[PDB]
A paper describes a structure:
The [name] [name] structure was determined in complex with the product analog malonate. Like the first reported [name] structure from E. coli, [name] [name] crystallized as a homodimer containing two subunits of the normally tetrameric enzyme, in which each chain forms an elongated central four-helix bundle capped by two compact domains at the N- and C-­termini. Structure alignment of the [name] [name] monomer with the human enzyme using MultiProt showed an r.m.s.d. of 0.99 Å over 92% of the sequence. The largest deviation is found in the C-­terminal region; otherwise the backbone structure is remarkably conserved, including the active site. The residues located within 6 Å of the ligand in the Rickettsia structure, Thr96, Ser98, Ser139, Ser140, Asn141, Ala231 and Leu358, are 100% conserved in the three other species and adopt almost identical conformations, even in the unbound structures: the r.m.s.d. for all atoms over those eight residues is 0.83 Å from the human structure, 1.09 Å from that from E. coli and 1.15 Å from that from S. cerevisiae. The only visible difference between the human and Rickettsia pockets is the tilting of the Ser140 hydroxyl group away from the active site in the human structure. A structure alignment with human mitochondrial fumarate hydratase highlights the close similarity between R. prowazekii and mitochondrial enzymes. [name] displays some essential features of a good drug target: it is clearly involved in a crucial biological pathway, is functionally well characterized and possesses a druggable binding site. However, the structural evidence obtained in the present study strongly indicates that this enzyme is an unsuitable target for therapeutic intervention against Rickettsia owing to the very high degree of conservation between the human and [name] structures in terms of both the global fold and the binding site.
A 2.4 Å resolution crystal structure of [name] fumarate hydratase, an enzyme catalyzing the third step of the tricarboxylic acid cycle pathway that ultimately converts phospho­enolpyruvate into succinyl-CoA, has been solved. Two classes of enzymes, class I and class II fumarate hydratase (fumarase; [name]), reversibly convert fumarate to l-malate and have no detectable sequence similarity. Class II fumarases ([name] enzymes) are homotetrameric, thermostable, iron-independent enzymes with a molecular mass of 200 kDa. Rickettsiae are obligate intracellular parasites of eukaryotic cells that are the causative agents responsible for spotted fever and typhus.
Residue numbers in the entry:
A (entry chain B), C (entry chain B): 3 to 316, 321 to 406
B (entry chain A), D (entry chain A): 3 to 457
Write the structure that this text describes.
């Protein structure tokens, strides 16, 4: 039931049914720190990275045809979800992500070797380092995967989620221009505005959130691949950085390019600190929008009672704004995640920032929580918001 | 493969092999927000809570023998680990934890009903709300679970890990009193201290971490159970609060009591915000300790090189033979996670409204994560780094003698003027202070090392 | 109009009317970073430190009688507020506080020299380093002053302020047990509780805040003095640490003692990070209390309207809960101050944490803002809170 | 020595030499909360605001010639710096900034009334609310001032300081291309890079800081003025908003416009929260740069020793001759202050209620402080550290040759096996790779240095 693998530290046992190699197993044994594995979309991004690197390596004459093709077939299968069991390493590993890099290197080599020899594992004929990792360091590969992942998640999770919110905020309030409600400043009675007008503030906040995302992504399109170990490009052929980036742009259909200065790309993660800053602003916007709805839906008899919130689950008969609670909790999570990203980003030393996994784990969590909670909020709260017109009219007609 | 269940809102389908009910399945369908489930030890805390509440209810005559005994047996199976598949709800739910409370209520009833009738699910003979949740709200139950879980995790994970680090810091540095290294202030050359003395700082930081936890636990021992919906204790018999706390104290063997003021326990989580603050401080201490070990072991040739860190894996694919301080990296990364987790807890804690703070799941999720991560990573750091740390004594000595600031250790022993002559001679010929001491016939190489000792 | 002073870097000009010396002026010229000077109470604490050190030095036989007496007279005058013009250095200086240490050393020497020779300044007969700073480093003196200051401010500003709040929360609500109001969970109508009961939550929060302060001060009583440059005590006579601490305990009438491990005292500021943690919890408590009052006083016609807040200043006739706004802003300040203290505390290197001035500036600001805002809040809001009983009764009698 | 004034609440005394009125003195007596006054540049912004609002009002025919001209002349004297004593109110006031708005309204009226009548104070001929505050609320005025001040400070303090740092990073490192130092990853010995290349990272961080500011300013150019109380623009004539923005654009020479949606501008300060986020990133960049320079200049003998930092003062009283990297300490301390200031702004920004975010003073206070501190400290760091940085070239070379990881730079030039023999020889005899290269007749001391160059 076991296979033996090795590296420069010696022999090590791996359970036969798993495709990973000596360094993954070594990491798996030595870092028994909680159960948070690397996010699926990061693994996906890392797989895309190896795919594109292999193609460039092949085109440069540096890989045998059968090895390049076997690596490519092997990676296509990972992208289809066939080896989700085979990336067991935790986030809390080496700060450069070396081990997760080797996790991808070894699994690809292993699948390819099973195709070519009939048996998985090992370094023949496909070597994890000399073929799958050819011309790469973890120091430039892991940041490249961090940026690919961030872009993919933002374009697939967050931007649609915000557009879903924008659309329903627009559609619901289109005809609330006839509803004249009483404004509150300091929570004290103020002068009148329409309910549509009040909701137009929220619409502006979300529109502006979408604009901030576009500006924050500009540096996240820029990829470190080609800097190798310390930023100089040692062991990377001239042109690799540019051709790799074009390859990733073509597969993702996103405008990726190479980072003009690779030293800045390795030594720091300022792009992601800035990006996390935009996530934080979005958290602030949503906290305000959700809090107002909580407040306007308070009651039914001893609150404000201007809005009726959909009732989705069960002091019997009492129904709570549960979606607002889920969303406002996520907002507080994102704000704390941002402080972690800040502090980790500030702790770079010379040629390398070695806080990379904690940074990307927090970025990707914030994107996913914001997207999922907003979509839930729209479906189970915003879509069925109705104003209580008689209540709004009574409140207005009492104002001094 | 499906069973039908019902609540106030109507009919709903549950996959047959699972034990939860209608309200849990409803929540499962309505809060599809990522993948972060309630932590194992919080579910455990909540089960313990229900076991004790059912026994007190039974003592008050408010549960029949058949029902109280089956509830108790069902809960023991959950505490045995037999139903870890049956708590699927995410953290990002209602802010009171109602759905997770009800998840526990339904699963207990369901296990009991299978035992009594042969078929799982439903509300007869055992009813989730009327029996399992009798005399309880989620408003007082969930805060009770939060504190039980915090105490359990702190005592089972955190205190043992810090003591593990303490013991090995003490053991490893016992005989480092004769290793005389150079002090660095502002990262600039300073005067000497023993390697042991430098480690004594770290030891003190961990001893103080342990004291801080004991003070931080004081209010976490106090339980909300009995406040019910708003804190008034309506639908709760006089004495239930005290008798429930006693039971939990017996089962856990921890000094749990009831909170004097139930309103404070529902409306806020200041106790967990204070506790998070202590976790924050521990993160700050560990960051300093781990950073020093990394800095002291930097090299092997182009850095400081005073400590040899155990080499556990290959550090690089391009540069073979390179070994990195990977355990320090995992620990310092965790430290940054705890610092951020603390801000989340702070902000959530500050957003209470009137009778209830409804940010409860996110608060307890961060507290428990911070505890697990500090504990797991400290344990790993000890096993794979502290255990095998060795000083590079020859390198430590070389560096000590390079310091020009040794002059001020020489002043009281050799005289102010004479030390000045040595330091002048060392600048002119470009030699060490030791070599200049021997050159001018003031002090041998052995007499020089004795004066330099801290004393 | 100028006097010339010097140090090992050479000669430097000081305006004649000022008492400080070469190193203070040098710092004053080289760190032109905003206008935040060291807090008054820190300077005060540093002056107390030099007073007690001199007395111990004198008792050990290490100072001439006339110098010890002149130093003591000189310091008594600083404590009386006579040289508030003479500590111009900014917080954003060397991270060990050396320059502010020399600021105190030089000014004391200067005043003493004016007494003894008729002219201020210089190092004769009282030398800033060899007499006023005898047996001291900035590395152990500045942490000692940080802890003295924190204790003094907490005992003189914060503890009385919280007791003032506790007392008035108690007195105002004593007879609110007859007022039956409707409870709100999730801001939805709930079951009843008395107004006194609701206020008893707030009373508990403040009581518990007072208990947390006592626990957090335990390590802040422990003083670094005697560790000198790197923690070893080089150039400090045996017994100095203990006798100094007793001297400070006697002058302040507070239970100060020496730090058992001086290395921990220099290398880190974990005591203050923990203390700042308690300030943060207090900020959280007060934010809740103040927010509820904002909410319960909302109206007069379109809010909850359960409480009447005092009207202290001027949509004419509209009066806002201005004291609650001041207080809740301070709370957000304290929470951010706490993150600065955290991050700075985490950045220690080997024998010394060199973020000391930013840490103490934030600690002392949080104490002063919390105290002043709470006292203001009590005087201009809590003292005159009255319930609107008819409104409370109407709301209750509408509950489902 | 006193003058009497009045408002809705009654009679109140003001010291005679000051120009403020009844509402300012009331606020002065009721908010005795520490000492933190409104920043100079925010007061200036608010004056500019009133100058432009009065001119637009006059153009609409809603101020008489006498009154508009005297208002304009009074404001110019405030912008000249003639009344810096007359704005005593603390930051910790009402959350809308009403009292500071009224401080400006009263002082302008008072200066104008002295000019027109000979006696300062009061509300005739110039009335604080009816003339100086005409068509304005504090709800739209204070946010307008916040953005004007942020733009002014960013353009006058921050952008110049970052450009100053940029210019000197470029100038100092121009000819450091021939200095070949060793790279460190995980603080472990790695492969070489030029000193210039290492500095190129820092240069990139600052160039990107400047781009980030330009994007962050986009929404700060947009002004609330015209929304009045709740955002509807009641008591504001159509066109006032556009014409006010134009005037401010003319006076400042900055591209200010009116905010399309006034409700968003009153109810929140997301734009300043986003801007704070950019300041945060700049703090993170500077922390890395300053920390590296400190680490590279550590020593002078027992650390890294690659850079010589200019020595500006004595570092110690016990250890004479010790010099500390004091400018790096002041800058990194400021960085921690900005990071905390950002959390305050984030939390304050998140506590808006309906039509108004009433945490405005604390938000703008932190933003402006962060800008001033980053600017002042970067400027000082350049003058007193970056300007005079020199590499210690002999030390840089020594360290480079100690690296065992040079082997991988030798592989493509000398062959894999041959480099292995050199590294084996270097381990056996305990020498450098260069000495072992010459020993085995593979490579001279000059040919070795050429292969090592990054290329
Ligand atoms: Na987090
Ligand atoms: Na601050």
């Amino acid at each position: 039931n076991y296979r033996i693998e090795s590296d420069s530290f010696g022999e090590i046992q791996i359970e036969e049914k798993f495709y990973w190699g000596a360094q993954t197993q070594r990491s798996l044994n030595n870092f028994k720190i909680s159960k948070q594995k690397m996010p699926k979309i990061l693994i996906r991004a890392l797989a895309i990275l190896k795919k594109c690197a292999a193609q460039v390596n092949y085109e440069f004459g540096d890989l045998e045809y059968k090895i390049a093709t076997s690596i490519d077939k092997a990676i296509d299968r990972i992208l289809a979800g066939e080896f989700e069991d085979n990336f067991p390493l935790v986030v809390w590993q080496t700060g450069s992500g070396t081990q997760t890099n080797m996790n991808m290197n070894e699994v690809i080599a292993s699948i390819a070797n099973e195709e070519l020899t009939g048996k998985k594992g090992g370094k023949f004929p496909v070597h994890p380092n000399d073929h799958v990792n050819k011309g790469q360091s973890s120091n430039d590969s892991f940041p490249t995967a961090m940026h690919i992942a961030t872009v993919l998640a933002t374009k697939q999770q967050l931007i649609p989620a915000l557009n879903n919110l924008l659309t329903y905020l627009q559609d619901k309030s289109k005809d609330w221009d006839k509803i004249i409600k009483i404004g509150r400043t300091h929570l004290q009675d103020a002068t009148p505005l329409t309910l549509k007008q009040e909701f137009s503030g929220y619409i502006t906040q979300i529109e502006y959130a979408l604009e901030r995302i576009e500006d924050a992504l500009k540096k996240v399109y820029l990829l470190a691949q080609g800097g190798t170990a310390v930023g100089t490009g040692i062991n990377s052929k001239i042109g690799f950085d540019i051709k790799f980036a074009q390859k990733v742009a073509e597969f993702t259909q996103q405008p990726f390019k190479t980072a003009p200065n690779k030293f800045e790309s390795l030594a720091a993660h300022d792009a992601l600190v800035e990006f996390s800053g935009t996530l934080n602003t979005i958290a602030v916007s949503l906290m305000k929008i959700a809090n107002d709805i909580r407040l306007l839906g308070s009651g039914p008899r001893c609150g404000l009672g201007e809005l009726h919130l959909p009732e989705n689950e069960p002091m019997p008969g009492k129904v709570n704004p549960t979606q607002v609670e889920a969303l406002t909790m996520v907002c507080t999570q994102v704000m704390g995640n941002h402080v972690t990203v800040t502090i980790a980003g500030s702790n770079g030393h010379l040629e390398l920032n070695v806080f990379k996994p904690v940074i990307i784990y927090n970025i990707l969590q914030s994107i996913e929580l914001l997207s999922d909670s907003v979509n839930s909020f729209v479906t189970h709260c915003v879509k069925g918001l109705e104003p209580n017109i008689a209540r709004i009219n009574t409140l207005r007609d009492k104002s001094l």
